DNA sequence: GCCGCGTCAGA
DNA sequence: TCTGACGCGGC
DNA sequence: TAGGATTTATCCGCAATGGAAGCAAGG
DNA sequence: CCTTGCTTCCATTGCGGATAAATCCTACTTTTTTATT
């Protein structure tokens, strides 16, 4: 439970649902981040990707 | 006498030319107010601090203004007294912010800065490669000090067995310590002046730009040491000063949550390992154990001074590295970059800007509510002045009611008082300009159009910050230097 | 070497150079420790202060100038036993001591023998060894000062000085005989003759306390230290052989707040303890015993230095018991225990549970990156509290001005007794007694006076500014 | 030729104002800002 | 450690006002700057104001 | 009633009178000359010394002690701070002022003319040199005048009478501090005719 | 000591305690504004040690310096809305108040 | 947002808030350079001494403001004392001189 | 430069003094400032502070960054006047 | 700067240096005992005491000499055990007792070693008769006019100890209660702790 | 003497 | 990351 | 990742005295 | 208009069990680990 609840509560990829539209929600759920564990960082990368 | 004048002169915060140097062990003790002997912080039940711990009223002044810890002295009668039950002295708790403590390290310990700052001060002072010094600090290998009447250079390093058969040869007239104790013996037994003259002559004679460059570097450091008057042996800590507890606070949060500063954990592991080293030394432990203890104590002190220049001790239960004193001074978000510069400022507001193109070049539209908050003390003063309020407390109630008189008073204290407007990325000096405010409804700051290009402003959501110059000098500077009607030409 | 900085690596590398040892080698090493320790016992037993002190201490506990169990821990081959054995010891001691006039040394030897029967506490034994040490230190300061004086002021070589001064150090044969040889340093032996002779005399005195020649006590204590060194080297061998056991046990307790190395260090402490207290004669292999002390010391130290806000070990035992019970409950009931359900599984009064539940929350760092790891941590959200609002400072200042001008109203006597009655603009406020005692009318008048001034103030047109200045 | 500073004559005049520069004016800062204030509008 | 929590819900009816940000759908942002009276707005032949 | 056996101009008696006026308590003042002091004084004070006080059961010599007793019995208004360190420093100043400058008054009066005027120069330079002190805080290291002023201001009062006058700079702060204390009403109400002739 | 949620809040006029129900919570439907007490809550407090002048105040006016500090929950400034819901959770064991 | 005075931080004594009286605006480096580019020394001083850090000067300033007398006593920013203590807490002896 | 203005004022005291101008990038040119506070507040702090410590440096404050850190009147602009007067009060009574 | 645990520049045998030491013991306050050579204080503390006088006390910012001042400072700073009465009459009375004792007998102790043998025997007999006169009062309260160890005793003990140095063995009317009083104050733990080696030397 | 390489600071 | 500087070392 | 068993120290509630009200009676 | 003086009634520090806290000690055997973008 520690591992799972950690992933779900305090993670870069678990985010407060952006909820002020139907559009905002439905676009939050179709988001494709390249960050998060095992990804890039906003300062590491990088003019190319 | 004139010594009274010398003293009253020392009781003066007007100075010049702040100095810096190394700290002798005796000086470090002098700063202190007492020794920290326990890793305890507070009492888990009645949160008053323990005795002689990282938060100790007897060492770092009282917790509550003008009363001892044991509550025996609260009355105003006793205001300089030292209670006897708790050794606390009844003064203002702000002294909890300036008194430093100290720890007596059971074994000397190298100050990591003067060891791992890349031109190794210790190294190039001893003319010993950093690799071999570290070999000595971790008790990997002995080092001769005063070989004496034998074939042993003063700094020739031996491994364990080499020193063994050395002893087998000569049980004496030859000294080889191991660990930071040895490095301290070397640094202390040195001679800056003799070696300075010798190296000077060697520099005079030999001609090989690598050797002459290293030589002038070393002669530079040596003459620097003899001019500064700092003893090199001080680069080895024996007393470790501890920070005032108010600057590493253990503030409580609502609901049992306590917020603490990492320095508490770093200090605590230092103190624990120091106490265990004392206890081991008393127990007469196997030398391997004592060596391991001295090693890990050195590791703790390094983590405290500069966490990261080694195996990077992270905090308990939180997988973040701890934040050490170096990490507080050094750092863009660290103090000296976030503190002493770029400070948060009172009397200041922020809001979204709009156009308002009816203004004159020296005016800005200021929302009424914002102004009523920015100038509140000016308004308190003016209200008490015109008698409309008996006391400052009455005036506070008035401006909370927003009685229709405070608006007249506000239009009065605003009359000629210019305010500063600053847009977010202040690229150049037109990023801050002074304006005279026009009291305005709504909540948007109305900015003259002609200055927009200066601020590089857009009315597409950009916000500006307002500051209120207080003193007469500041108002006159704003009117004469930073008024908008003076910046028409660019200084570029 | 791989130029490694990890102390874990260095320690593990350094501990493996010693290898383990068999279960019978353990018996051998234990036998060695026993050799050394019983030898130091006997070497003390020769020193008569030992036996005189033991008999004195039994006679003192028989007058309760000491305690029962602090004098013995059994006999190697009970009050009746204690009295009969101390009477036997008194018998041996009196029949050996007064016979100094040789049979003296052998009789004190037999007294040493009977003393070897006993096992006192390590505490009074520590008293004994400390006495031995202070005696040796008397010998030490004596020799040091004496040789310093008689080869520095006297300028004698060291060899010719020691081959006569040493050995007796109570009889002055060296003193007269050297001058009889008529050497220049023998002549200068007149210079510090007095100080050195009086120091030698104090040495005589101490010897009289010992009854044995400084030569004899020196031999005694040299034998003593030899036995002790033997014991220490044997202990070293055992500890360096079981360091691996310590590593094994410590491994378990890793992530409870202490680094791996702090754990193994506390373990090593526990191991030295076990080695000290370990008896092989029980035929129990050493690890069987030492495991207890190691686990014990590690758990105790985890309790003592893991949390920032230390909680005493009984409370940590309670918290751990609660966690054990809560795990059982959670995994059995499935959902969760509520504090009532716990208090049922435990027997606590259902409120002690809540106290314990409040304790164990640990202090969160003032540097945890606040949301999204932004340019800000928790530390910059904790406002100060001790300060007073600059508004409140101004209010206080104006209040002082106000009270001052109100008190201007009342006559001098009234404002005086008022300012003195509370603490206005002076040091501690005084009780009315002192107000009178300085006010020449030690009377209940003063309290009526205070009340009258309070009225005359609270009266309109004087109060009304303060009923307007109501705050 | 000045030590620790520059003479108001070696510097020049250019300014918001239009006359020769006034003593005590901090030219180094406004120079750093004039050079770096562009830039974050045109790389290349 | 807590005894009882009371949560209160406020409903606010925020009207538009000078300063609020408005935007079409093609990245034409903008901060409204004047609430103009009706009789000032431009208007076509049928008198409908914009 | 408390009686004070004051000296006509004895600076000690001056201080005692000043603190009496400061606490402002009634007292049967008695001027005394050291030739034929009143019989009662010699009946009570074996030293036969002035100033000297009685309070209906208690007698004290040595003005320092007297001031301490007064300030300890008649609190309002306080003349020694609370902080034992501050009290200690004030006591040290009360002692040093005396030890150094009363034994200069004693040269200028009870010594030869050469010693008199050499010490006059010495004292003058001392006062002018420490003058910047009073230039910061109102009174002698305080915000409210205290027993150190009771010690200091009397000697400062008799300065023309010692014929010691002031240079340019030091006189500024000297006169500032003077009018500070020279105006203080307790100073005046404490004065006698025997003194004003000096100033 | 525990904290209380009653409407017994010192020195706030019945203009302030107007909209609190008898149990200290606000009435549903209340149009509130900045500063108004939503939930009146007092916390125990001690060790006053007030300055001499405040002591003289309490003397001349008999104002008993109460021991319960005010810590009620009030509307943040600038926001002026309607209360549309009030939820009350209580740790079990604690006796419920009328409103709960 | 806007504030005149409010709560202050704990270790450094500078403004901060979340309680609808937030901190003041950050007067970061670039603004300091702007004030240096003007000759505005007094504005800058009161900006980083009395408006922010000087724990005693700021209250003296408040009392002066309400008294109709606009003047400032500079003292020394508390953040600087903190920096001193954190340097001294290394092995380094840093001190004001005179 | 001032060395030479002097040792050429007195001509007997120095008969020789020569150098070569040297150029550093802005970063390095800030490292090598006289005042360790100006430097340590901008560059790497550990290195600057270590070096200044083992040299016993002394920082006259002579500058804008320094006078801002410690929070006193900047020696430029409106502050200039004051600072002038101050250094006249010093180097004198 | 000013250092540490509050050292004291105690003369090794100076009477006032002993007064303050007795006090410090009575407050039980940790401190250092700095010694001066015999009469010239270490040439470096003159950086503190322009009078170059001992005993001198320093707590990290505060220098004090003139033992009376120092003892009053300690009694106020460390208020327990109280070493002075609590009432103004008694406090002033004790201050006067100390003033009289000093100005009468310490001057005589100084003249004894400071004049010819004429003054020596004269002042010796003088203080002897004076003590035998004050004698009957000693019996009243366990200590000198006080039911508990008061600061005035810290004026008596340092003198009574130094009688051997002046050669007066108490015989005659009053040499009973006086020996009993020296028994009380001399055997007092704090007083023992006050004693330096040289201070014990004057006794057997 | 000259080139490759590890180490750190900084965005 | 990456870029640069640079001790530090190998050729 | 125990726990009994021992031993002590700290705290919480109880009551005894000194200060301050409260009449209550002469100046 | 006063001006003392006698009851009385409440904070304040010895003075007490109840709990918290610290110490000590265990016996089949158990032996190089861990720890990781
Ligand atoms: Mg924009
Ligand atoms: Zn206390
Ligand atoms: Zn020029």
Structural summary, described in words:
This is part of a larger assembly, with four copies of chain A, three copies of chain B, one copy of chain C (471 residues) and two copies of chain F. With 49 residues, chain A is mostly helical. Chain A has helices spanning 2-9, 22-28. In chain A, 31% of the residues lie in helices and 0% in strands. The N and C termini of chain A lie far apart (36 Å). The relative contact order of chain B is 0.08. By secondary structure, chain B is an alpha+beta fold. In chain B, 38% of the residues lie in helices and 15% in strands. Chain C is mainly alpha-helical and 471 residues long. Chain C folds into three domains: 5-64 and 78-305, Orthogonal Bundle (RNA Polymerase Primary Sigma Factor); 306-386, Winged helix-like DNA-binding domain superfamily/Winged helix DNA-binding domain (Arc Repressor Mutant, subunit A, Orthogonal Bundle), CATH 1.10.10; 387-468, Arc Repressor Mutant, subunit A. Chain F contains nine helices and four strands; from the N terminus they run E-H-E-H-E-E-H-H-H-H-H-H-H. The longest helix of chain F has 27 residues, at 84-110. The radius of gyration of chain F is 17 Å and the shape is globular. Chains in contact: B-C, B-D, B-E, B-F, B-G, B-H, B-I, B-J, C-F, C-G, C-H, D-H, D-I, E-G, F-J, H-I. At the B-H interface, strand 1, helix 2, strand 7, helix 13 and strand 9 of B face strand 1, helix 1, helix 2, helix 3 and helix 4 of H. Strand 8 (259-260) of chain B pairs parallel with strand 1 of chain C, so a sheet runs across the interface. The complex binds magnesium ion (MG) and zinc ion (2 copies).
In short:
With 49 residues, chain A is mainly α.
Q: Tags for this entry?
A:
10 chains; C: 471 residues; mainly alpha; RNA Polymerase Primary Sigma Factor; Arc Repressor Mutant, subunit A; 3 domains; 0% strand; extended; F: 199 residues; alpha+beta; 2 domains; 4-stranded mixed β-sheet; 4 strands; 6% strand; binds magnesium ion; binds zinc ion; DNA-directed RNA polymerase subunit beta' (chain I)
Strand content of chain F: 5-15%
Cα radius of gyration of chain C in angstroms: 39 Å
Order of helices and strands of chain C: HHHHHHHHHHHHHHHHEHHHH
The CATH class assignment of the largest domain in chain C is Mainly Alpha
- The side-by-side strand order for the widest beta sheet of chain F comes to 2-1-3-4
Specify the number of helices of chain C. Answer: 20
Ligand set = magnesium ion, zinc ion
Topology pattern of chain F, helix = H, strand = E: EHEHEEHHHHHHH
Alpha carbon gap, first and last residue of chain F? 32 Å
Main sheet summary of chain F: 4 strands, mixed
The number of distinct helices of chain F, counting runs of at least 4 residues, comes to: 9
Family (chain D): Belongs to the RNA polymerase beta' chain family.
Binding site for Zn(2+) 2 (chain D): 7, 10
Protein name (chain D): DNA-directed RNA polymerase subunit beta'
Organism (chain D): Escherichia coli (strain K12)
């Amino acid at each position: 439970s520690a591992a799972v609840k950690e992933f779900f509560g305090s993670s870069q990829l678990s985010q407060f649902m952006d909820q002020n539209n139907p559009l905002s929600e439905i676009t939050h759920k179709r988001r494709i981040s390249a960050l998060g564990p095992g990804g890039l960082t906003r300062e590491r990368a990088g003019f190319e990707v | 006498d004139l010594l009274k004048f010398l003293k009253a002169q020392t009781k003066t915060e007007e100075f010049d030319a702040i100095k810096i140097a190394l700290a002798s062990p005796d000086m470090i003790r002098s700063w202190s107010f007492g020794e920290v002997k326990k890793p305890e912080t507070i009492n888990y039940r009645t949160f008053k601090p323990e005795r002689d711990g990282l938060f100790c009223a007897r060492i770092f002044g009282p917790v509550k203004d003008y009363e001892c810890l044991c509550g025996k002295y609260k009355r105003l009668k006793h205001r300089g007294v030292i209670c006897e039950k708790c050794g606390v002295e009844v003064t203002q708790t702000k002294v909890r912010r300036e008194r430093m403590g100290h720890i007596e390290l059971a074994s000397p310990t190298a100050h990591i800065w003067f060891l791992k700052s890349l031109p190794s001060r210790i190294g190039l002072l001893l003319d010993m490669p950093l690799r071999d010094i570290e070999r000595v600090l971790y008790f990997e290998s002995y080092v001769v000090i005063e070989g004496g009447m034998t074939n042993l250079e003063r700094q020739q390093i031996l491994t364990e067995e080499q020193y063994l058969d050395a002893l087998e040869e000569f049980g004496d007239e030859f000294d080889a310590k191991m660990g930071a104790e040895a490095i301290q013996a070397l640094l202390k037994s040195m001679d800056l002046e003799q070696e300075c003259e010798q190296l000077r002559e060697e520099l005079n004679e030999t001609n090989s730009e690598t050797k002459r460059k290293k030589l002038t570097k070393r002669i530079k450091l040596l003459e620097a040491f003899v001019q500064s008057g700092n003893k090199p042996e001080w680069m080895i800590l024996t007393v470790l000063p501890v920070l005032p507890p108010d600057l590493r606070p253990l503030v409580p949060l609502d609901g049992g949550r306590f917020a603490t500063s990492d320095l508490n954990d770093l200090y605590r592991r230092v103190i624990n390992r120091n106490n265990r080293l004392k206890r081991l030394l008393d127990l007469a432990a196997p030398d391997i154990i004592v060596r391991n203890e001295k090693r890990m104590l050195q590791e703790a002190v390094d983590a405290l001074l500069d966490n990261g220049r080694r195996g990077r001790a992270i905090t308990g239960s939180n997988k973040r590295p701890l934040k050490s004193l170096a990490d507080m001074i050094k750092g863009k978000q660290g103090r000296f970059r976030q503190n002493l510069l770029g400070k948060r400022v009172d009397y200041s507001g922020r809001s979204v800007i709009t156009v308002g193109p009816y203004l004159r070049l020296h005016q800005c539209g200021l929302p009424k509510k914002m102004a009523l908050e920015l100038f509140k003390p000016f308004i308190y003063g003016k209200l008490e002045l015109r008698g409309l309020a008996t006391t400052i407390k009455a005036a506070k109630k008035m401006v909370e009611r927003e009685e229709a008189v405070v608006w007249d008073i506000l239009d009065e204290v605003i009359r000629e008082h210019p305010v500063l407007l600053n847009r977010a990325p202040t690229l150049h000096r037109l990023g801050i300009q002074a304006f005279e405010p026009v009291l305005i409804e709504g909540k948007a700051i109305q900015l003259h159009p002609l200055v927009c290009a200066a601020y590089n402003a857009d009315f597409d959501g950009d916000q500006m910050a307002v500051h209120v110059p207080l003193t007469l000098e500041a108002q006159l500077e704003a009117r004469a230097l930073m008024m908008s009607t003076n910046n028409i030409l660019s200084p570029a | 070497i791989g130029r490694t900085t990890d102390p874990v690596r260095m320690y593990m590398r350094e501990m493996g150079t010693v290898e383990l040892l068999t279960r019978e080698g353990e018996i051998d090493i234990a036998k060695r420790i026993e050799d050394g320790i019983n030898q130091v016992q006997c070497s003390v037993a020769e020193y008569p202060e030992a036996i005189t002190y033991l008999l004195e201490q039994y006679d003192r506990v028989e007058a309760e100038e000491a305690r029962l169990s602090d004098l013995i821990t059994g006999f190697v081959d009970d009050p009746e036993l204690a009295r009969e054995k101390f009477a036997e010891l008194r018998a041996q001691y009196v029949v050996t001591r007064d016979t100094i006039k040789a049979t003296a040394q052998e009789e004190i030897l037999k007294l040493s023998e009977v003393f070897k029967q006993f096992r006192l506490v390590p505490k009074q034994f520590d008293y004994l060894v400390n006495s031995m040490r202070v005696m040796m230190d008397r010998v030490r300061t004596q020799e040091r000062l004496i040789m310093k004086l008689c080869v520095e002021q006297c300028k004698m070589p060291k060899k010719n000085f020691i081959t006569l001064f040493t050995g007796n150090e109570t009889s002055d044969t060296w003193f007269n005989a050297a001058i009889a040889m008529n050497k220049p340093w023998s002549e200068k032996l007149h210079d510090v003759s007095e100080e050195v002779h009086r120091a030698l005399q104090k040495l005589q005195q101490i010897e009289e306390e010992t009854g044995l020649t400084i030569e004899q006590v020196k031999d005694i204590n040299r034998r003593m230290s030899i036995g002790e060194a033997k014991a220490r080297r044997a202990k070293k061998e055992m500890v360096e052989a079981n360091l691996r056991l310590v590593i094994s046990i410590a491994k378990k307790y890793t992530n409870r707040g202490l680094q791996f190395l702090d754990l193994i260090q506390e373990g090593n402490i526990g191991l030295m303890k076990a080695v000290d207290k370990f008896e092989y004669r029980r035929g129990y292999k050493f690890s069987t015993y030492a495991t207890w002390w190691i686990r014990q010391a590690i758990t105790r130290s985890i309790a003592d230095q893991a949390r920032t806000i230390r909680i005493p070990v009984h409370m940590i035992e309670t918290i751990n018991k609660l966690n054990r019970i809560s795990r059982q409950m959670l995994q059995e009931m499935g959902r969760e225990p509520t504090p009532e359900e716990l208090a049922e599984r435990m027997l606590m009064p259902e409120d002690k549970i809540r106290k314990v539940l409040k304790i164990a929350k640990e202090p969160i760092s003032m540097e945890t990156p606040i949301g999204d790891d932004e340019d800000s941590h928790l530390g910059d959200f904790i406002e100060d509290t001790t300060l007073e609002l600059p508004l409140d400072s101004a209010t206080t200042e104006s209040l002082r001005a106000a009270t001052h001008d109100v008190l201007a109203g009342l006559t001098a006597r009234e404002a005086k007794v008022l300012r003195m009655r509370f603490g206005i603009d002076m040091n501690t406020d005084y009780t009315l007694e002192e107000v009178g005692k300085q006010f020449d009318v030690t009377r209940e008048r003063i309290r009526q006076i205070e009340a009258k001034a309070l009225r005359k103030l609270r009266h309109p047109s004087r109060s009304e500014v303060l009923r307007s200045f109501l705050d | 030729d000045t030590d620790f500073g520059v003479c108001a004559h070696c510097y020049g005049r250019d300014l918001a104002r239009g006359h020769i520069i006034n003593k005590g004016e901090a030219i180094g800062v406004i120079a750093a800002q004039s050079i770096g204030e562009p830039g974050t509008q045109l790389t290349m | 450690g807590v005894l009882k929590i009371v949560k209160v819900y406020l409903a606010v009816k925020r009207r538009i006002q000078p300063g609020d940000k408005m935007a079409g759908r093609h990245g034409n942002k903008g901060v409204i700057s004047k609430i103009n009276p009706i009789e000032d707005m431009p208007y076509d032949e049928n008198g409908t104001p914009v | 009633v408390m009686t004070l056996f004051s000296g006509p101009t004895d600076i000690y008696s001056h201080q005692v009178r000043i603190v009496l006026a400061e606490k402002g308590v009634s007292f049967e003042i008695e001027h005394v000359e050291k030739d034929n002091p009143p019989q009662d004084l010699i009946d009570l004070n074996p030293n036969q010394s002035v100033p000297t006080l009685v309070d209906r059961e208690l007698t004290l010599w040595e003005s320092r002690i007297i001031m301490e007793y007064l300030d300890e019995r008649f609190p309002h208004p306080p003349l020694m701070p609370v902080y034992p360190v501050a009290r200690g420093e004030s006591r040290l100043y009360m002692h040093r002022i005396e030890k150094d400058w009363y034994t200069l008054m004693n040269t200028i009066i009870n010594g030869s003319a050469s010693e008199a005027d050499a010490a006059r120069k010495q004292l003058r330079e001392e006062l002018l040199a420490i003058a910047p002190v009073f230039g910061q805080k109102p009174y002698f290291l305080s915000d409210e005048f205290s027993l150190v002023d009771c010690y200091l201001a009397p000697l400062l009062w008799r300065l023309p009478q010692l014929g010691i006058e002031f240079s340019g700079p030091g006189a500024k702060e000297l006169k500032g501090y003077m009018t500070r204390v020279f105006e203080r009403d307790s100073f005046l109400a404490s004065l006698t005719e025997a003194e004003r002739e000096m100033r | 000591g525990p904290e209380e949620i009653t409407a017994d809040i010192p020195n706030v006029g019945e203009a302030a305690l107007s909209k609190l129900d008898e149990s200290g919570i606000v009435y549903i439907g209340a149009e509130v504004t900045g500063g108004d007490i939503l939930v009146g809550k007092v916390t125990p407090k001690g060790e006053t040690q007030l300055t001499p002048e405040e002591k003289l105040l309490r003397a001349i006016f008999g104002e008993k310096a109460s021991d319960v500090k005010d810590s009620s929950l009030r509307v943040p400034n600038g926001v002026s809305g309607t209360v549309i819901d009030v939820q009350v959770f209580t740790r079990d064991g604690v006796e419920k108040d009328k409103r709960a | 947002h806007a504030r005149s005075t409010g709560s202050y931080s704990l270790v450094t004594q500078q403004p901060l808030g979340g309680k609808a009286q937030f901190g003041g605006q950050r007067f970061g480096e670039m603004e300091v350079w702007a004030l240096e580019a003007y000759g505005a020394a007094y504005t800058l001083q009161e900006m980083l001494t009395v408006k922010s850090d000087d724990v005693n000067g700021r209250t003296k300033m408040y009392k002066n403001i309400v008294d109709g007398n606009h003047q400032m006593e500079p003292g020394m920013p508390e953040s600087f004392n903190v920096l001193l203590k954190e340097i001294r807490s290394l092995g380094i002896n840093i001190e004001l001189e005179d | 430069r001032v060395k030479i203005a002097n040792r050429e004022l007195e001509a007997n005291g120095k008969v020789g003094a020569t150098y070569s101008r040297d150029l550093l990038g802005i970063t390095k040119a800030s490292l090598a400032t006289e005042s360790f506070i100006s430097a340590a507040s901008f560059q790497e702090t550990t290195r600057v502070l270590t070096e200044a410590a083992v040299a016993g440096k002394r920082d006259e404050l002579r500058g804008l960054k320094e006078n801002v850190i410690v929070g006193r009147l900047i020696p430029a602009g409106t502050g200039y006047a004051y600072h002038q007067d101050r250094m006249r009060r010093r180097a004198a009574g």
